[PDB]
């Protein structure tokens, strides 16, 4: 079943891919791998071919490579970017060094759309509804994105949306939950709900909600709207030093959101209050938010599916580089493409 490969050097870097992928265009580099846009003659789709060149330089790298492949092979949902293909030109484990991941390159990112257009409240309802539909699926497998922001949401002309680029580490901080920013405690799935509130708030006002400079600055901005922590939340902060820093602040009441978002759909503002709650344990879940009156036109409890269970037991495994590499190789080989 090995397809025919063709090789070419694009921008001082070698790509060896199946002939099904045509007209490769370097669309970016990084520190985690180069990316090219291409035409996938098999599906007729425009796709992103991501080459990981350095996959196994450390235990951290090898493990993160395996984690990214595991996550991506598990994602089967309309509002979540899935794996269209994964391949290596290697004919055996011994010569295995490069891994390539292929995903659908749909529309443009939300940040790009907003730069060229003022969305209506209607767009906002449907877009946010799609993010939460995707998040209910993800959270049901006990997966946390961890890095949601406009640049990680693909949107097309017909308003379809898919969540992409999951945080693989185990502007950017402007969407992060207070408790994960300073690492106050072990994170809840609702750190993604906090990012959603930040995203929606910005879509409605056309202004970034918490545009802080550093952690303290951003924390202060956050706590001014949402108020400062109480005893309940303080009991949950594991770090004694963070708790001492928290108590040193001058107390701040929560603000009323209705004065901050005047003229916005009142239901939108109500959902915002439920998403942007300081205590993570009290933030609305994605399943609950889908049931919120703001999405009345779009809610269908018979079509907001959950995921199969995702085995994260590997996270606690303590293995050698070659063992993580071998597990990764096995996952490439076992990959079954989507219809």
């Amino acid at each position: 079943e090995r397809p025919t490969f063709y090789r070419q050097e694009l921008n001082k870097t070698i790509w060896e891919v199946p002939e099904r992928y045509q007209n490769l265009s370097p669309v970016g580099s990084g520190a985690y791998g180069s990316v090219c846009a291409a035409f996938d003659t098999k599906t007729g789709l425009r796709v992103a071919v991501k080459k990981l060149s350095r996959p196994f330089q450390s235990i951290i790298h090898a493990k993160r490579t395996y984690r990214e492949l595991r996550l991506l092979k598990h994602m089967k949902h309309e509002n979540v970017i899935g794996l269209l293909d994964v391949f290596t030109p290697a004919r055996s484990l011994e010569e295995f060094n490069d891994v390539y991941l292929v995903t659908h390159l749909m529309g443009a990112d939300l940040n790009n759309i907003v730069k060229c257009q003022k969305l209506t409240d209607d767009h906002v309802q449907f877009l946010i509804y799609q993010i939460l539909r995707g998040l209910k699926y993800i959270h049901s497998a006990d997966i946390i994105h961890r890095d949601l922001k406009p640049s990680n949401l693909a949107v097309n002309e017909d308003c379809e949306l898919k969540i992409l680029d999951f945080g693989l580490a185990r502007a950017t901080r402007w969407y992060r939950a207070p408790e994960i920013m300073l690492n106050w405690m072990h994170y809840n799935q609702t750190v993604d709900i906090w990012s959603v509130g930040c995203i929606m708030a910005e879509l409605l006002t056309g202004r970034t909600l918490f545009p802080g400079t550093d952690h303290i600055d951003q924390l202060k901005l956050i706590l001014r709207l949402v108020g400062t922590p109480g005893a309940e939340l303080l009991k949950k902060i594991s770090s004694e030093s963070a708790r001492n820093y928290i108590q040193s602040l001058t107390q701040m009441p929560k603000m009323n959101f209705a004065n901050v978002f005047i003229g916005a759909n009142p239901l939108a503002v109500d959902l915002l209050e439920k998403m942007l709650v300081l205590d993570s344990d009290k933030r609305i879940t994605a399943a609950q938010a889908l049931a919120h009156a703001y999405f009345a036109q779009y809610h269908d409890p018979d079509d907001e599916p959950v995921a199969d269970p995702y085995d994260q037991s590997f996270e606690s495994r303590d293995l050698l580089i070659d063992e993580w590499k071998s597990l990764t190789y096995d996952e490439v080989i076992s990959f079954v493409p989507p219809p």
Partner: peptide, 24 residues
């Protein structure tokens, strides 16, 4: 890209939601 008006947009999800909204 420019996003069409939701009224003009057509996709599988919207199609589905519009089909339920009539079976009602």
């Amino acid at each position: 890209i420019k996003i069409k008006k939701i009224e003009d947009a057509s996709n599988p999800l919207l199609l589905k939601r519009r089909k339920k909204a009539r079976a009602l």
